[PDB]
Amino acid sequence: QDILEPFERALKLQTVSSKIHQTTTLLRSSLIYVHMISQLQMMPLETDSTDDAALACGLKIAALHSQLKINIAANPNLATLQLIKSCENNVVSPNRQELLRYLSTNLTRDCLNNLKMENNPKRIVTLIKALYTLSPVDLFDTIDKVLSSKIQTTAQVLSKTITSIRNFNLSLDDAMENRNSILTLQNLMAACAIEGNTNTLRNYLSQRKFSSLIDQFWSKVTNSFKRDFEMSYNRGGPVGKSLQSNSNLIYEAISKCFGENDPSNELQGELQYILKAVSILD
Amino acid sequence: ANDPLLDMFFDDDFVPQAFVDILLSSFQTSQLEELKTNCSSLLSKMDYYSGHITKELESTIQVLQKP
C-alpha cells in the first residue's frame, strides 16, 4: 500500500487546510471587531445637551453598537476570548452605558415637558426606537420612570387643593393635561414596530401588570389622592368639613371635566377612578 | 525543520480557538493599534500558507488517480 500513504497525506492536508481557515476566520473576526472599537472611541459625544446635532452624533454611536452585537453573533466563537471580553467591559460596556444615560435622560426630559410631547412627536419616536434597539429593558425602566413621574406630579397637584377645594376644577384640569400626554405617548409607543409582529406598547404592557398607560396612571394617582382626601375628611378638622360642605361642587366640577358615566363619553371608566377617590361624601 | 507557523498547523492537538486567544493577549488598551498591525501581517502569512496547502492538496489528490 503505497496507495494508503497518499490517501493518508491527503486526509491530513484537509485537516491542516481547515485549521488554517478557522484560525484565519477567527483572527479576522477579531480584527474587524477591533477596527470597530477604534472607530467607536473616535466618536465623542455631547452629554445632556440636546443641541440637536448632539443627537445626530448619538445615533451614529448607537448604530456602531448594533454592528458590534452583529459581529459577535456572526462568530459566537468571538465572545470566549479573554482579550475581547477585556475590552467588551473596558471600552464598550462603558461607552454603552454613557450612551444609555444620554438617551434615557433625553427621552425622560422630552416627555415630562408636555409641550415637546405634542410639538416634537417625530423626535420622541426616534428616541423610543433608538433606546429599545440598544437595550430594551432600559427603554422600559425609562418609561417606568417617566410614567411614575407624571402620576407623582398630578397626584400632588390634586391634593394641594384639598385645603382649598374651591380651586378643584383647576387641579382636575391639570390632571387631564397629563392624562392627555399619556394618551399621546402610548400611541407613539405602538407606532414603533418590532420583529415580525407587535409593537413597543404591547410589549411593555405584557411585561407589566398594566393594561394601558392611562389605566395605571389614573389608578395610581387615584390612590395617593384618595388616601389624602379621606385622611383629611376623617380628621374632623375644618378642611375635612369644607370637604363635606362643598360636596356638590366637587361632584359638579368632576362631571364638567369628564362627562359622567355609562352611555356616551369614552372618558367613562377613566372617570370612574376619580369618582372612587372622592367617595366618603356618603 | 520548516517554519514554526506552518508546522504549528500540522499538529493534531493544534486548536484554532486556543491559538488566537493566547495571541491577542499582549494586551489591549491603546496598544491595540500595535497588535492590530501585527495581526495584519501574521494574517498575510497564514494566507500564503493557506494557498500553499491547497496547492499541495490538489497535487496529492491527483496521485490517488491510478499510480
Side-chain angles (χ1 to χ4, degrees):
Chain A
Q1 305 153 328
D2 283 326
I3 56 179
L4 288 198
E5 284 185 30
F7 155 70
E8 280 163 19
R9 170 81 184 170
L11 237 319
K12 172 64 171 188
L13 256 18
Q14 286 219 281
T15 293
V16 182
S17 211
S18 287
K19 277 167 183 164
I20 292 177
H21 184 74
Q22 303 174 358
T23 308
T24 260
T25 301
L26 206 268
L27 201 41
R28 285 207 166 85
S29 271
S30 323
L31 232 234
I32 305 185
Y33 184 77
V34 152
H35 267 106
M36 287 209 291
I37 286 206
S38 296
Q39 206 87 29
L40 221 221
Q41 294 176 304
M42 211 161 51
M43 282 174 300
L45 209 44
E46 193 89 4
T47 62
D48 287 340
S49 61
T50 157
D51 52 49
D52 215 322
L55 184 270
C57 178
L59 260 16
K60 289 185 178 181
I61 289 185
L64 232 302
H65 275 277
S66 269
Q67 303 310 286
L68 262 335
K69 288 169 188 61
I70 295 172
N71 189 17
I72 65 146
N75 269 150
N77 285 323
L78 255 220
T80 76
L81 295 172
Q82 278 186 339
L83 243 286
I84 237 168
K85 280 166 171 296
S86 290
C87 64
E88 174 71 38
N89 73 81
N90 276 351
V91 180
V92 4
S93 161
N95 185 286
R96 193 176 198 274
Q97 258 183 326
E98 189 221 311
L99 208 287
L100 263 302
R101 201 185 318 114
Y102 176 80
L103 290 180
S104 63
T105 71
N106 241 271
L107 174 62
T108 45
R109 181 165 68 216
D110 280 4
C111 277
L112 303 177
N113 191 217
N114 275 6
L115 274 75
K116 327 267 210 67
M117 191 73 225
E118 285 264 332
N119 295 349
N120 257 283
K122 310 179 195 175
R123 169 148 175 126
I124 289 174
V125 169
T126 312
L127 272 329
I128 292 183
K129 295 201 179 189
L131 189 50
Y132 182 78
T133 295
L134 219 176
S135 171
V137 87
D138 277 290
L139 171 75
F140 301 156
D141 290 8
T142 286
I143 260 44
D144 268 346
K145 280 179 185 164
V146 162
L147 181 60
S148 198
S149 181
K150 290 176 128 44
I151 82 190
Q152 205 239 75
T153 262
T154 274
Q156 179 183 349
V157 83
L158 290 176
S159 279
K160 275 174 202 168
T161 42
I162 291 176
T163 52
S164 37
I165 15 70
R166 305 115 69 257
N167 289 330
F168 187 63
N169 39 305
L170 305 174
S171 286
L172 205 46
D173 282 345
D174 287 335
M176 274 287 308
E177 291 263 347
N178 278 8
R179 141 77 166 66
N180 280 343
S181 263
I182 293 189
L183 180 269
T184 76
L185 178 61
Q186 73 192 4
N187 276 342
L188 217 286
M189 274 190 68
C192 305
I194 328 193
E195 180 124 356
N197 205 260
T198 65
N199 52 69
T200 65
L201 183 65
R202 163 186 301 174
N203 227 45
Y204 173 75
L205 300 176
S206 72
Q207 295 172 26
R208 305 265 177 279
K209 297 181 177 182
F210 329 158
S211 75
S212 77
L213 296 191
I214 276 82
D215 236 15
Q216 250 260 345
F217 168 78
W218 286 128
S219 178
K220 286 280 163 161
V221 330
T222 256
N223 296 353
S224 73
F225 171 74
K226 178 193 168 72
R227 167 182 48 93
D228 286 1
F229 196 81
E230 292 190 346
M231 204 196 177
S232 193
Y233 190 87
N234 281 331
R235 182 196 313 119
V239 319
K241 286 184 182 313
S242 85
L243 249 37
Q244 186 55 46
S245 68
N246 280 258
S247 180
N248 62 309
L249 169 53
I250 298 167
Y251 275 119
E252 182 177 329
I254 281 191
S255 55
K256 293 200 186 163
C257 179
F258 277 87
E260 175 236 19
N261 274 315
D262 300 342
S264 170
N265 241 351
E266 189 173 337
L267 303 165
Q268 185 199 13
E270 305 180 34
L271 151 79
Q272 262 140 20
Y273 283 107
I274 193 62
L275 282 185
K276 295 168 194 164
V278 187
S279 75
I280 51 278
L281 298 310
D282 206 28
Chain B
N2 276 55
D3 176 50
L5 217 240
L6 179 55
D7 255 297
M8 150 186 304
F9 286 125
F10 277 80
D11 172 24
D12 295 344
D13 311 298
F14 172 85
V15 19
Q17 261 274 27
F19 170 83
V20 183
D21 201 25
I22 73 183
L23 170 64
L24 266 20
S25 299
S26 172
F27 57 102
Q28 60 124 354
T29 51
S30 57
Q31 73 180 244
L32 71 315
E33 272 274 345
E34 308 268 19
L35 271 144
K36 176 163 47 184
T37 81
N38 249 81
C39 286
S40 273
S41 71
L42 195 272
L43 238 20
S44 279
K45 191 176 191 295
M46 283 173 40
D47 275 347
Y48 172 84
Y49 284 143
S50 163
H52 172 72
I53 259 50
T54 296
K55 257 155 261 177
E56 293 277 74
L57 226 196
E58 186 172 77
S59 185
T60 293
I61 288 182
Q62 297 172 359
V63 325
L64 257 42
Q65 183 65 264
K66 176 149 52 86

PDB file of all heavy atoms in Angstrom, chain B residues 52-63:
ATOM      1  N   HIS B  52      -0.801  27.525  -0.259  1.00  0.00           N
ATOM      2  CA  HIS B  52       0.255  26.555  -0.405  1.00  0.00           C
ATOM      3  C   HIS B  52      -0.344  25.210  -0.081  1.00  0.00           C
ATOM      4  O   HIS B  52      -0.174  24.246  -0.835  1.00  0.00           O
ATOM      5  CB  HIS B  52       1.439  26.881   0.511  1.00  0.00           C
ATOM      6  CG  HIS B  52       2.490  25.809   0.554  1.00  0.00           C
ATOM      7  ND1 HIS B  52       3.338  25.560  -0.499  1.00  0.00           N
ATOM      8  CD2 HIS B  52       2.831  24.934   1.525  1.00  0.00           C
ATOM      9  CE1 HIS B  52       4.136  24.551  -0.195  1.00  0.00           C
ATOM     10  NE2 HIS B  52       3.857  24.159   1.033  1.00  0.00           N
ATOM     11  N   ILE B  53      -1.029  25.124   1.051  1.00  0.00           N
ATOM     12  CA  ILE B  53      -1.553  23.843   1.466  1.00  0.00           C
ATOM     13  C   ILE B  53      -2.579  23.373   0.427  1.00  0.00           C
ATOM     14  O   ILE B  53      -2.609  22.188   0.067  1.00  0.00           O
ATOM     15  CB  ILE B  53      -2.136  23.903   2.909  1.00  0.00           C
ATOM     16  CG1 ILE B  53      -1.148  23.326   3.909  1.00  0.00           C
ATOM     17  CG2 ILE B  53      -3.363  23.024   3.054  1.00  0.00           C
ATOM     18  CD1 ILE B  53       0.204  23.858   3.818  1.00  0.00           C
ATOM     19  N   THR B  54      -3.396  24.297  -0.077  1.00  0.00           N
ATOM     20  CA  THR B  54      -4.393  23.950  -1.089  1.00  0.00           C
ATOM     21  C   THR B  54      -3.712  23.412  -2.326  1.00  0.00           C
ATOM     22  O   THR B  54      -4.112  22.387  -2.868  1.00  0.00           O
ATOM     23  CB  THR B  54      -5.268  25.144  -1.433  1.00  0.00           C
ATOM     24  OG1 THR B  54      -6.012  25.506  -0.257  1.00  0.00           O
ATOM     25  CG2 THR B  54      -6.211  24.837  -2.585  1.00  0.00           C
ATOM     26  N   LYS B  55      -2.644  24.060  -2.755  1.00  0.00           N
ATOM     27  CA  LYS B  55      -1.903  23.538  -3.881  1.00  0.00           C
ATOM     28  C   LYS B  55      -1.344  22.145  -3.586  1.00  0.00           C
ATOM     29  O   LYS B  55      -1.405  21.259  -4.439  1.00  0.00           O
ATOM     30  CB  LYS B  55      -0.788  24.495  -4.249  1.00  0.00           C
ATOM     31  CG  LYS B  55      -1.080  25.315  -5.460  1.00  0.00           C
ATOM     32  CD  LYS B  55      -0.294  26.610  -5.455  1.00  0.00           C
ATOM     33  CE  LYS B  55      -1.149  27.774  -4.965  1.00  0.00           C
ATOM     34  NZ  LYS B  55      -0.344  29.023  -4.885  1.00  0.00           N
ATOM     35  N   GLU B  56      -0.818  21.935  -2.376  1.00  0.00           N
ATOM     36  CA  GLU B  56      -0.246  20.623  -2.034  1.00  0.00           C
ATOM     37  C   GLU B  56      -1.344  19.580  -2.060  1.00  0.00           C
ATOM     38  O   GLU B  56      -1.151  18.475  -2.599  1.00  0.00           O
ATOM     39  CB  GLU B  56       0.439  20.626  -0.660  1.00  0.00           C
ATOM     40  CG  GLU B  56       1.683  21.488  -0.579  1.00  0.00           C
ATOM     41  CD  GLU B  56       2.934  20.804  -1.089  1.00  0.00           C
ATOM     42  OE1 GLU B  56       3.091  20.650  -2.317  1.00  0.00           O
ATOM     43  OE2 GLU B  56       3.790  20.450  -0.251  1.00  0.00           O
ATOM     44  N   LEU B  57      -2.514  19.967  -1.539  1.00  0.00           N
ATOM     45  CA  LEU B  57      -3.705  19.111  -1.537  1.00  0.00           C
ATOM     46  C   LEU B  57      -4.093  18.682  -2.948  1.00  0.00           C
ATOM     47  O   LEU B  57      -4.212  17.496  -3.239  1.00  0.00           O
ATOM     48  CB  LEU B  57      -4.882  19.835  -0.893  1.00  0.00           C
ATOM     49  CG  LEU B  57      -5.713  19.058   0.124  1.00  0.00           C
ATOM     50  CD1 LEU B  57      -7.020  19.743   0.364  1.00  0.00           C
ATOM     51  CD2 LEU B  57      -5.962  17.673  -0.367  1.00  0.00           C
ATOM     52  N   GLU B  58      -4.288  19.659  -3.821  1.00  0.00           N
ATOM     53  CA  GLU B  58      -4.618  19.381  -5.207  1.00  0.00           C
ATOM     54  C   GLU B  58      -3.652  18.363  -5.798  1.00  0.00           C
ATOM     55  O   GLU B  58      -4.079  17.382  -6.391  1.00  0.00           O
ATOM     56  CB  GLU B  58      -4.603  20.691  -6.009  1.00  0.00           C
ATOM     57  CG  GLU B  58      -5.053  20.626  -7.463  1.00  0.00           C
ATOM     58  CD  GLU B  58      -5.170  22.015  -8.066  1.00  0.00           C
ATOM     59  OE1 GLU B  58      -4.115  22.609  -8.400  1.00  0.00           O
ATOM     60  OE2 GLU B  58      -6.312  22.522  -8.181  1.00  0.00           O
ATOM     61  N   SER B  59      -2.353  18.597  -5.606  1.00  0.00           N
ATOM     62  CA  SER B  59      -1.300  17.773  -6.195  1.00  0.00           C
ATOM     63  C   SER B  59      -1.362  16.357  -5.620  1.00  0.00           C
ATOM     64  O   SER B  59      -1.153  15.379  -6.327  1.00  0.00           O
ATOM     65  CB  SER B  59       0.070  18.411  -5.973  1.00  0.00           C
ATOM     66  OG  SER B  59       1.096  17.684  -6.626  1.00  0.00           O
ATOM     67  N   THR B  60      -1.672  16.255  -4.331  1.00  0.00           N
ATOM     68  CA  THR B  60      -1.732  14.956  -3.669  1.00  0.00           C
ATOM     69  C   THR B  60      -2.893  14.084  -4.171  1.00  0.00           C
ATOM     70  O   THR B  60      -2.725  12.916  -4.524  1.00  0.00           O
ATOM     71  CB  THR B  60      -1.896  15.142  -2.162  1.00  0.00           C
ATOM     72  OG1 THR B  60      -0.707  15.727  -1.639  1.00  0.00           O
ATOM     73  CG2 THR B  60      -2.158  13.809  -1.480  1.00  0.00           C
ATOM     74  N   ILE B  61      -4.068  14.683  -4.226  1.00  0.00           N
ATOM     75  CA  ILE B  61      -5.251  14.006  -4.701  1.00  0.00           C
ATOM     76  C   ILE B  61      -5.074  13.495  -6.143  1.00  0.00           C
ATOM     77  O   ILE B  61      -5.586  12.434  -6.469  1.00  0.00           O
ATOM     78  CB  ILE B  61      -6.458  14.934  -4.580  1.00  0.00           C
ATOM     79  CG1 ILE B  61      -6.822  15.087  -3.113  1.00  0.00           C
ATOM     80  CG2 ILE B  61      -7.623  14.434  -5.372  1.00  0.00           C
ATOM     81  CD1 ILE B  61      -8.003  15.930  -2.877  1.00  0.00           C
ATOM     82  N   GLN B  62      -4.329  14.209  -6.995  1.00  0.00           N
ATOM     83  CA  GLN B  62      -4.070  13.722  -8.358  1.00  0.00           C
ATOM     84  C   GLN B  62      -3.348  12.378  -8.393  1.00  0.00           C
ATOM     85  O   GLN B  62      -3.552  11.591  -9.307  1.00  0.00           O
ATOM     86  CB  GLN B  62      -3.227  14.698  -9.167  1.00  0.00           C
ATOM     87  CG  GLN B  62      -3.833  16.047  -9.427  1.00  0.00           C
ATOM     88  CD  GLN B  62      -2.821  16.985 -10.062  1.00  0.00           C
ATOM     89  OE1 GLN B  62      -1.669  16.604 -10.284  1.00  0.00           O
ATOM     90  NE2 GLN B  62      -3.241  18.214 -10.354  1.00  0.00           N
ATOM     91  N   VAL B  63      -2.492  12.119  -7.413  1.00  0.00           N
ATOM     92  CA  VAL B  63      -1.716  10.884  -7.412  1.00  0.00           C
ATOM     93  C   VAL B  63      -2.587   9.696  -7.004  1.00  0.00           C
ATOM     94  O   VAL B  63      -2.281   8.535  -7.313  1.00  0.00           O
ATOM     95  CB  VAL B  63      -0.487  10.987  -6.493  1.00  0.00           C
ATOM     96  CG1 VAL B  63       0.059  12.387  -6.529  1.00  0.00           C
ATOM     97  CG2 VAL B  63      -0.829  10.591  -5.091  1.00  0.00           C
TER      98      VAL B  63
END
